[PDB]
RNA sequence: CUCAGCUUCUUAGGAGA
RNA sequence: UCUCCUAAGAAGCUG
């Protein structure tokens, strides 16, 4: 039963670490995506506005 | 309404705008961090609001610094 | 006699008011509003028609007394500081009755200057207003703007306020004539504001008796003792800047190698202050007692405003060592505690050691000697040098937001439209110049001359608030850090952690060091770092690192006593008490401590760390040393303090690369900073209570006992010279009695006898406001403070928790609860991006429920639902956590002792008293 | 046996750090002399009626170089107008001008009609005239 | 990237019943 | 199996 315990907590240190290098790694893309998300989901004119004439080209 | 709505999405607006390097101008850093903060600060949705588009417009001003036409398909 | 009566008083106009005096005599003692006597006040008009500030005092007055003060005025008539007075007799009712007038008199005395810039109130200063605006300091005008007297708000007050000074140095001059024409009279008597008009002369006599011409005595204790915050306050000695003492003539051009002024100290000690009778010592390492050190640290505040800024600070040397030259410290000029030298200043050493190489590499001497000239525009702080070619702007980035939580709080019903609960808390970000901007917030530090008199029993008060704890030096091994992994300060911060030097040196080079620093100066450098925390204000905070060789020497010198403070229970300062498991609860049934007809009051002090005076902070420290009378020698005890003083008082701060001088205050970050503050929050309490006590006509205390606490209270400040214990210990059970305090640092609850609040026999809101005011250099705000009437209620806020009286069990238990707010935030709001991934995180979700529990309790909803809300996620988080493990594993995480976490008992268990 | 060893190694590890932090110290004021003017140094201590000075008149009086921070052109115009200015009983000229984000700014560029255009606070960096 | 206090969780070790 | 005490690591709150 101990050793079944060593194993869990090693195992729960390597999740730990390849969860925190891969959110560390992920960070720009997911803020820039997190970022659009929100904007589409408050869907404000002027804000909608603005980023379809950036899309465009029509940039400030 | 949509208060708390606005000022999240200027926290991850000025996060992505730091991970940009815009505090390598210390003017447009300035006036984004002061954005933010009345943001932040608001009582008042459409203050917000207008706060919030000029936070974007420096965004989007570096057309070539982040992918807008990707980011939203 | 109307017509005849204002001829003989003669160009005068023809002719119930309260003004303040300064009574003692066997029936009444203090210094209050009374009514005016009747008299005869015919104002004199110029020859324009235009009225002056000149009046003639007309008084009736007894053949007995009016012999006696004839006799007296015929002795000291010849003086220039003496109102001219005219003695006649009057025909009334067909008998000659004889009158006595003062003439050219001002309206107002110096005992009301005193009295309405010590007991200011903002809706009651009409007196103020009409001084300030008959001496043109300003005009009706300038009252018309909101915070025209706040210190922060508008910092221009300073400048109106200074604008009598003059008058008042002029007051002090010919005070001081008067006082040499009574010794040269032979007429001992006491002098008292309110005999003082504010053009500086004098004029009343009744009191006064004759003796041998050579021998006279005038006793001057109350008058200057009163006087002293008014002489920093109007900044009276800013004309012995200048030379010849002429404010219209160029300022005096010292010598820059000058630092030594003690010629100069006491040749202002002899021009304003001769009949002072105490000694006065220019450099306080002469001092005899820490009480001797106080009363002469009050008069060098007050004297080196007058010296340039830069002969103040470490006065460094050059020195030899292996044949090469080093500028190392031997010594340092303190502002209030004059020139002090090093005993063990060591030329041409042979080698350094590690004990000498750590000190000379935390002196500021050498970094600041190799170091550029800096002229720094953006702050009016003395700045001394460049130490890096470029300047560096540290900025603070936002938060990272946790959308996960978000999204599962609003899929939950929160951050609806009109809900109470709504995001307050947020990680606000700051530009480059954010750091400097916070340090000008020093601006706030003022010379502060005290009450000497009143400080002095203040403090004895206050030291009876700290007999119950132990304290003393301790050896190297028996000090305890609590965490290794923190900066050791500047330079000491580019080659380790505390943890290298606490392992470099061993115990007994640590000895070594402690010895060192009891006979000699080590000034340090601070560093000045950006906090990054959730706050509900737009508002940087820095907070201060110490160098590592101050730290250890101050963890040396104070721990046992800092250790003893926070083990106690059941005390009035409440640090190191937990609010866990009942402790609330105790504490509070503490502080009610069954006062008579208890009220709760508390407050919290407006810039608290950049404006505490300079003398306070000698105060407190002075205080807690007060515990090595067996282990420290008196010069040992001074040169502790001259090292904390130069460490953590008027040290230079480092800032962007850059070397500042710290006017004062508390560097939060040093070793005693919250005992400290509550010293000073017990003693800001302490002269509360002393200036309501005294501040109360003594003929409307209906009880005797409190008008002989009164009286005596009155002897023990300003006749008696020698500490009284037996009052001090009546008084500190008076206090206990009525007005029950729990402090922690700058925070505190009070339990007062609220009849005798409304009475005047103890403090209330009005009272802290005014001391605050004249000892602090702040104007408190009543939104500031707070009062709760009904103590079922618990205080309004302590350390920003709210209380709630709660049944649990059987028995109805006072629970603290945070702001929701401040919970939510937190849970959206992280400051590393690992922390929004929930699964990684969940113990700090299982604190955040902690402390969110006692919301449950709360008869809001919407409150409530925040507890559940976390309980909620957590099982969520858990869930989440275990399908990953599965997926990325074949296995099954086989805990179950998780379930308790988001069922209540765990989180209900942490607040009752059993543990 | 093994706790005996490790102490050992613990010991050995904290007497390596004490030698290189001994090290770098030594070092650190042993560089740190070799910037000061040995001249101007010399002649203000041999002045002092017995060694001892105040420390925040050395840089004053010795210092080779000034470095002024600057929040506004109205400061800016103050303080060090032109390209040599007057400053502690000294005169001192201009050698560099930088922004807050350390770019190089010619003196024709601060004035009032450009003054938005700059990025504030500016450092000047001049050198004590006359030797 | 400071001082101090309190609290939760995990691990290693010692003692007692 | 339970309790206490030493050390190390993670985290939360407060002034
Ligand atoms: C009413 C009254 C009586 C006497 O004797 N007085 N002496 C001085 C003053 C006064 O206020 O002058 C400044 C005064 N008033
Ligand atoms: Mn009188
Ligand atoms: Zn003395
Ligand atoms: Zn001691």
């Given at each position: 039963?101990?050793?079944?315990?060593?194993?869990?907590?090693?195992?729960?240190?390597?999740?730990?670490?390849?969860?925190?290098?891969?959110?560390?790694?992920?960070?720009?893309?997911?803020?820039?995506?997190?970022?659009?998300?929100?904007?589409?989901?408050?869907?404000?004119?002027?804000?909608?506005?603005?980023?379809?004439?950036?899309?465009?080209?029509?940039?400030? | 309404?949509?208060?708390?709505?606005?000022?999240?999405?200027?926290?991850?607006?000025?996060?992505?705008?730091?991970?940009?390097?815009?505090?390598?101008?210390?003017?447009?850093?300035?006036?984004?961090?002061?954005?933010?903060?009345?943001?932040?600060?608001?009582?008042?949705?459409?203050?917000?609001?207008?706060?919030?588009?000029?936070?974007?417009?420096?965004?989007?001003?570096?057309?070539?610094?982040?992918?807008?036409?990707?980011?939203?398909? | 006699?109307?017509?005849?009566?204002?001829?003989?008083?003669?160009?005068?106009?023809?002719?119930?008011?309260?003004?303040?005096?300064?009574?003692?005599?066997?029936?009444?003692?203090?210094?209050?509003?009374?009514?005016?006597?009747?008299?005869?006040?015919?104002?004199?008009?110029?020859?324009?028609?235009?009225?002056?500030?000149?009046?003639?005092?007309?008084?009736?007055?007894?053949?007995?007394?009016?012999?006696?003060?004839?006799?007296?005025?015929?002795?000291?008539?010849?003086?220039?500081?003496?109102?001219?007075?005219d003695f006649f007799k009057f025909r009334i009712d067909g008998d000659m009755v004889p009158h006595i007038s003062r003439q050219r008199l001002t309206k107002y005395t110096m005992a009301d200057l005193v009295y309405a810039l010590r007991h200011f109130d903002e809706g009651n200063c009409d007196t103020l207003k009409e001084i300030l605006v008959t001496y043109n300091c300003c005009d009706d005008d300038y009252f018309?703007?909101?915070?025209?007297?706040?210190?922060?708000?508008?910092?221009?007050?300073?400048?109106?306020?200074?604008?009598?000074?003059?008058?008042?140095?002029?007051?002090?001059?010919?005070?001081?004539?008067?006082?040499?024409?009574?010794?040269?009279?032979?007429?001992?008597?006491?002098?008292?504001?309110?005999?003082?008009?504010?053009?500086?002369?004098?004029?009343?006599?009744?009191?006064?008796?004759?003796?041998?011409?050579?021998?006279?005595?005038?006793?001057?204790?109350?008058?200057?003792?009163?006087?002293?915050?008014?002489?920093?306050?109007?900044?009276?000695?800013?004309?012995?800047?200048?030379?010849?003492?002429?404010?219209?003539?160029?300022?005096?051009?010292?010598?820059?190698?000058?630092?030594?002024?003690?010629?100069?100290?006491?040749?202002?000690?002899?021009?304003?202050?001769?009949?002072?009778?105490?000694?006065?010592?220019?450099?306080?390492?002469?001092?005899?007692?820490?009480?001797?050190?106080?009363?002469?640290?009050?008069?060098?505040?007050?004297?080196?405003?007058?010296?340039?800024?830069?002969?103040?600070?470490?006065?460094?040397?050059?020195?030899?060592?292996?044949?090469?030259?080093?500028?190392?410290?031997?010594?340092?000029?303190?502002?209030?505690?004059?020139?002090?030298?090093?005993?063990?200043?060591?030329?041409?050493?042979?080698?350094?050691?590690?004990?000498?190489?750590?000190?000379?590499?935390?002196?500021?001497?050498?970094?600041?000697?190799?170091?550029?000239?800096?002229?720094?525009?953006?702050?009016?702080?003395?700045?001394?040098?460049?130490?890096?070619?470029?300047?560096?702007?540290?900025?603070?980035?936002?938060?990272?937001?946790?959308?996960?939580?978000?999204?599962?709080?609003?899929?939950?019903?929160?951050?609806?439209?009109?809900?109470?609960?709504?995001?307050?808390?947020?990680?606000?970000?700051?530009?480059?110049?954010?750091?400097?901007?916070?340090?000008?917030?020093?601006?706030?530090?003022?010379?502060?001359?005290?009450?000497?008199?009143?400080?002095?029993?203040?403090?004895?008060?206050?030291?009876?608030?700290?007999?119950?704890?132990?304290?003393?030096?301790?050896?190297?091994?028996?000090?305890?850090?609590?965490?290794?992994?923190?900066?050791?300060?500047?330079?000491?911060?580019?080659?380790?952690?505390?943890?290298?030097?606490?392992?470099?040196?061993?115990?007994?080079?640590?000895?070594?060091?402690?010895?060192?620093?009891?006979?000699?100066?080590?000034?340090?450098?601070?560093?000045?770092?950006?906090?990054?925390?959730?706050?509900?204000?737009?508002?940087?905070?820095?907070?201060?690192?110490?160098?590592?060789?101050?730290?250890?020497?101050?963890?040396?010198?104070?721990?046992?006593?800092?250790?003893?403070?926070?083990?106690?229970?059941?005390?009035?300062?409440?640090?190191?008490?937990?609010?866990?498991?009942?402790?609330?609860?105790?504490?509070?049934?503490?502080?009610?401590?069954?006062?008579?007809?208890?009220?709760?009051?508390?407050?919290?002090?407006?810039?608290?760390?950049?404006?505490?005076?300079?003398?306070?902070?000698?105060?407190?420290?002075?205080?807690?040393?007060?515990?090595?009378?067996?282990?420290?020698?008196?010069?040992?005890?001074?040169?502790?303090?001259?090292?904390?003083?130069?460490?953590?008082?008027?040290?230079?701060?480092?800032?962007?690369?850059?070397?500042?001088?710290?006017?004062?205050?508390?560097?939060?970050?040093?070793?005693?900073?919250?005992?400290?503050?509550?010293?000073?929050?017990?003693?800001?309490?302490?002269?509360?209570?002393?200036?309501?006590?005294?501040?109360?006509?003594?003929?409307?205390?209906?009880?005797?006992?409190?008008?002989?606490?009164?009286?005596?209270?009155?002897?023990?400040?300003?006749?008696?010279?020698?500490?009284?214990?037996?009052?001090?210990?009546?008084?500190?059970?008076?206090?206990?009695?009525?007005?029950?305090?729990?402090?922690?640092?700058?925070?505190?609850?009070?339990?007062?006898?609220?009849?005798?609040?409304?009475?005047?026999?103890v403090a209330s809101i009005k009272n802290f406001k005014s001391v605050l005011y004249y000892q602090n250099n702040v104007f408190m705000s009543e939104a500031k403070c707070w009062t709760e009437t009904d103590l079922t209620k618990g205080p309004h806020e302590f350390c920003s928790q709210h209380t709630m009286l709660v049944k649990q069990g059987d028995d109805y238990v006072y629970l603290p609860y945070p702001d929701?707010?401040?919970?939510?935030?937190?849970?959206?709001?992280?400051?590393?991006?690992?922390?929004?991934?929930?699964?990684?995180?969940?113990?700090?979700?299982?604190?955040?429920?902690?402390?969110?529990?006692?919301?449950?309790?709360?008869?809001?909803?919407?409150?409530?639902?925040?507890?559940?809300?976390?309980?909620?996620?957590?099982?969520?988080?858990?869930?989440?956590?275990?399908?990953?493990?599965?997926?990325?594993?074949?296995?099954?995480?086989?805990?179950?002792?998780?379930?308790?976490?988001?069922?209540?008992?765990?989180?209900?268990?942490?607040?009752?008293?059993?543990? | 046996?093994?706790?005996?060893?490790?102490?050992?190694?613990?010991?050995?590890?904290?007497?390596?750090?004490?030698?290189?932090?001994?090290?770098?110290?030594?070092?650190?004021?042993?560089?740190?002399?070799?910037?000061?003017?040995?001249?101007?140094?010399?002649?203000?201590?041999?002045?002092?009626?017995?060694?001892?000075?105040?420390?925040?008149?050395?840089?004053?009086?010795?210092?080779?170089?000034?470095?002024?921070?600057?929040?506004?052109?109205?400061?800016?115009?103050?303080?060090?107008?032109?390209?040599?200015?007057?400053?502690?009983?000294?005169?001192?000229?201009?050698?560099?001008?930088?922004?807050?984000?350390?770019?190089?700014?010619?003196?024709?560029?601060?004035?009032?009609?450009?003054?938005?255009?700059?990025?504030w606070p500016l450092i000047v960096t001049a050198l004590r005239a006359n030797s």
């Amino acid at each position: 039963r101990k050793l079944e315990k060593m194993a869990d907590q090693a195992m729960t240190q390597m999740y730990k670490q390849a969860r925190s290098e891969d959110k560390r790694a992920k960070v720009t893309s997911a803020m820039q995506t997190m970022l659009f998300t929100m904007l589409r989901k408050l869907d404000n004119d002027a804000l909608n506005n603005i980023i379809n004439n950036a899309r465009d080209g029509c940039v400030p | 309404s949509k208060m708390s709505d606005v000022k999240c999405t200027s926290v991850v607006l000025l996060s992505v705008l730091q991970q940009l390097r815009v505090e390598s101008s210390s003017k447009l850093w300035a006036q984004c961090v002061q954005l933010h903060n009345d943001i932040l600060l608001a009582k008042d949705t459409t203050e917000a609001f207008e706060k919030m588009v000029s936070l974007l417009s420096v965004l989007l001003s570096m057309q070539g610094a982040v992918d807008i036409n990707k980011l939203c398909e | 006699d109307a017509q005849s009566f204002l001829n003989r008083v003669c160009r005068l106009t023809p002719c119930v008011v309260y003004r303040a005096f300064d009574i003692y005599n066997d029936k009444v003692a203090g210094f209050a509003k009374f009514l005016k006597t009747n008299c005869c006040r015919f104002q004199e008009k110029d020859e324009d028609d235009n009225l002056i500030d000149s009046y003639f005092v007309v008084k009736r007055h007894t053949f007995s007394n009016y012999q006696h003060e004839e006799t007296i005025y015929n002795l000291l008539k010849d003086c220039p500081a003496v109102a001219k007075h005219d003695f006649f007799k009057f025909r009334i009712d067909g008998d000659m009755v004889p009158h006595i007038s003062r003439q050219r008199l001002t309206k107002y005395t110096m005992a009301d200057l005193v009295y309405a810039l010590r007991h200011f109130d903002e809706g009651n200063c009409d007196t103020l207003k009409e001084i300030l605006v008959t001496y043109n300091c300003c005009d009706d005008d300038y009252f018309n703007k909101k915070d025209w007297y706040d210190f922060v708000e508008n910092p221009d007050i300073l400048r109106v306020y200074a604008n009598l000074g003059e008058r008042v140095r002029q007051a002090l001059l010919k005070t001081v004539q008067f006082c040499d024409a009574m010794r040269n009279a032979g007429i001992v008597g006491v002098l008292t504001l309110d005999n003082q008009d504010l053009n500086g002369n004098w004029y009343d006599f009744g009191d006064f008796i004759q003796t041998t011409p050579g021998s006279g005595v005038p006793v001057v204790d109350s008058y200057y003792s009163l006087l002293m915050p008014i002489l920093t306050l109007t900044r009276a000695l800013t004309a012995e800047s200048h030379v010849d003492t002429d404010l219209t003539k160029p300022y005096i051009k010292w010598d820059l190698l000058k630092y030594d002024f003690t010629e100069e100290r006491l040749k202002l000690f002899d021009r304003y202050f001769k009949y002072w009778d105490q000694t006065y010592h220019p450099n306080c390492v002469n001092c005899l007692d820490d009480r001797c050190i106080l009363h002469c640290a009050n008069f060098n505040v007050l004297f080196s405003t007058v010296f340039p800024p830069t002969s103040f600070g470490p006065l460094v040397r050059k020195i030899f060592v292996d044949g090469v030259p080093f500028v190392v410290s031997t010594g340092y000029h303190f502002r209030e505690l004059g020139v002090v030298h090093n005993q063990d200043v060591n030329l041409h050493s042979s080698r350094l050691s590690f004990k000498e190489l750590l000190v000379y590499a935390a002196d500021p001497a050498m970094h600041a000697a190799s170091g550029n000239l800096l002229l720094d525009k953006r702050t009016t702080c003395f700045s001394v040098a460049a130490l890096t070619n470029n300047v560096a702007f540290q900025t603070v980035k936002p938060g990272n937001f946790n959308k996960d939580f978000y999204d599962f709080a609003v899929s939950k019903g929160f951050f609806k439209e009109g809900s109470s609960v709504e995001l307050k808390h947020f990680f606000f970000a700051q530009d480059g110049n954010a750091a400097i901007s916070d340090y000008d917030y020093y601006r706030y530090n003022l010379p502060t001359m005290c009450d000497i008199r009143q400080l002095l029993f203040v403090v004895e008060v206050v030291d009876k608030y700290f007999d119950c704890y132990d304290g003393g030096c301790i050896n190297a091994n028996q000090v305890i850090v609590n965490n290794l992994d923190k900066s050791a300060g500047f330079p000491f911060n580019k080659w380790g952690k505390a943890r290298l030097y606490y392992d470099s040196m061993s115990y007994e080079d640590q000895d070594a060091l402690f010895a060192y620093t009891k006979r000699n100066v080590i000034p340090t450098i601070t560093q000045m770092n950006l906090k990054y925390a959730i706050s509900a204000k737009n508002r940087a905070r820095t907070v201060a690192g110490v160098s590592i060789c101050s730290t250890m020497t101050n963890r040396q010198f104070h721990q046992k006593l800092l250790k003893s403070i926070a083990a106690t229970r059941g005390a009035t300062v409440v640090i190191g008490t937990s609010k866990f498991y009942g402790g609330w609860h105790n504490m509070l049934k503490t502080v009610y401590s069954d006062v008579e007809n208890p009220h709760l009051m508390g407050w919290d002090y407006p810039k608290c760390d950049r404006a505490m005076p300079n003398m306070l902070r000698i105060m407190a420290s002075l205080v807690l040393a007060r515990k090595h009378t067996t282990c420290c020698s008196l010069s040992h005890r001074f040169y502790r303090l001259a090292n904390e003083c130069a460490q953590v008082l008027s040290e230079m701060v480092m800032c962007g690369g850059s070397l500042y001088v710290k006017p004062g205050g508390t560097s939060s970050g040093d070793a005693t900073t919250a005992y400290a503050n509550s010293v000073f929050n017990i003693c800001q309490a302490v002269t509360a209570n002393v200036n309501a006590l005294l501040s109360t006509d003594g003929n409307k205390i209906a009880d005797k006992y409190v008008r002989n606490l009164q009286h005596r209270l009155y002897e023990c400040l300003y006749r008696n010279r020698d500490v009284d214990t037996d009052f001090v210990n009546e008084f500190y059970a008076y206090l206990r009695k009525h007005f029950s305090m729990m402090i922690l640092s700058d925070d505190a609850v009070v339990c007062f006898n609220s009849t005798y609040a409304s009475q005047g026999l103890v403090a209330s809101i009005k009272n802290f406001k005014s001391v605050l005011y004249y000892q602090n250099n702040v104007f408190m705000s009543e939104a500031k403070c707070w009062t709760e009437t009904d103590l079922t209620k618990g205080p309004h806020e302590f350390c920003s928790q709210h209380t709630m009286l709660v049944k649990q069990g059987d028995d109805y238990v006072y629970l603290p609860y945070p702001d929701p707010s401040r919970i939510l935030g937190a849970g959206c709001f992280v400051d590393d991006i690992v922390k929004t991934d929930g699964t990684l995180m969940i113990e700090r979700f299982v604190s955040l429920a902690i402390d969110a529990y006692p919301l449950t309790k709360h008869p809001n909803q919407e409150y409530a639902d925040v507890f559940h809300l976390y309980l909620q996620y957590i099982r969520k988080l858990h869930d989440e956590l275990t399908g990953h493990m599965l997926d990325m594993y074949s296995v099954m995480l086989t805990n179950d002792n998780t379930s308790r976490y988001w069922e209540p008992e765990f989180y209900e268990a942490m607040y009752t008293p059993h543990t | 046996a093994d706790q005996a060893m490790t102490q050992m190694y613990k010991q050995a590890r904290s007497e390596d750090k004490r030698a290189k932090v001994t090290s770098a110290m030594q070092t650190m004021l042993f560089t740190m002399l070799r910037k000061l003017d040995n001249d101007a140094l010399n002649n203000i201590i041999n002045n002092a009626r017995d060694g001892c000075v105040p420390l925040n008149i050395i840089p004053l009086t010795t210092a080779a170089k000034l470095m002024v921070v600057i929040p506004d052109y109205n400061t800016y115009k103050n303080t060090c107008d032109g390209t040599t200015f007057t400053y502690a009983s000294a005169l001192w000229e201009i050698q560099q001008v930088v922004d807050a984000d350390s770019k190089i700014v010619q003196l024709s560029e601060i004035s009032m009609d450009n003054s938005p255009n700059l990025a504030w606070p500016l450092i000047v960096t001049a050198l004590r005239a006359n030797s």
